[PDB]
């Protein structure tokens, strides 16, 4: 009756250990430009300076 109630607590603590190791993995994982920077306007391509612009200026 007491071995089962200790195995329950050990399972509940190993669950927290797995959760902690997971939530540590999750932060060091790299992340998208749409999640790290603003979601709308998801491309990093600037295309900036649009009045006196030259054709051939893109690459």
């Amino acid at each position: 009756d007491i071995l089962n109630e200790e195995a329950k607590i050990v399972q509940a603590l190993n669950n927290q250990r797995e959760l902690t190791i997971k939530m540590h993995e999750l932060k060091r994982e790299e992340k998208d430009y749409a999640h790290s920077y603003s979601p709308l306007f998801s491309d990093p391509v600037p295309q900036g300076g649009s009045i006196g612009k030259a054709p051939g200026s893109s690459r």
């Binding site: 030259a54 054709p55 051939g56 200026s57 893109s58 690459r59």
Partner: protein, 171 residues
């Protein structure tokens, strides 16, 4: 793109085109004849000019060397327009750009000569002067009667030729 300051010294280059690229003869018109016939260069050579700039857009960064074959043809077609306008309308083309070299090359001050030039070129060279991007319900500026912006002094040769075209019934 930026302009030279702080003791620029000019330098030129004693050299030639390589053999790979053929000869192309140049435009010898200066700013008042170029500004005079700008709309007729643009009316005849629209698809050539647009293919040249579309070349320059398509192969980015290579630029100069990969677009030489159509930069050839835009220059040759503009030269065709300018000798075409010489041999038909030399005296009033000359009347127009001689008006234009006074008055700061403003097109606002040479209306009575450009009416004559537009009428000649439209009946003989069959090219029309148009301003695009102009929706209807909007009058084009070089057509309007009594504009707010008149020049300081109208040129004498063009008002004399304009009155004589009135009395001939030319215009």
């Amino acid at each position: 793109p930026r302009e030279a300051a702080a003791h620029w010294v000019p330098f030129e280059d004693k050299a030639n085109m390589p053999d790979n690229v053929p000869d192309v003869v140049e435009v010898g018109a200066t700013s008042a004849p170029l500004l005079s016939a700008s709309y007729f260069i643009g009316a005849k050579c629209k698809p050539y000019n647009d293919d040249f700039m579309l070349c320059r857009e398509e192969s980015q960064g290579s630029g100069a060397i990969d677009c030489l074959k159509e930069g050839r043809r835009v220059t040759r077609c503009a030269v065709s327009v300018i000798e075409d306008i010489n041999k038909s309308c030399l005296d009033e083309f000359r009347l127009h750009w001689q008006c234009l070299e006074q008055n700061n090359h403003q097109l606002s001050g040479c209306r009575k000569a450009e009416a004559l030039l537009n009428k000649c070129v439209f009946t003989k060279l069959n090219l029309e002067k148009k301003i695009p991007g102009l929706r209807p319900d909007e009058e084009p500026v070089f057509l309007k009667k009594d504009p707010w912006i008149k020049p300081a002094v109208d040129d004498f040769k063009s008002v004399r030729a304009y009155a004589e075209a009135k009395k001939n019934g030319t215009l």
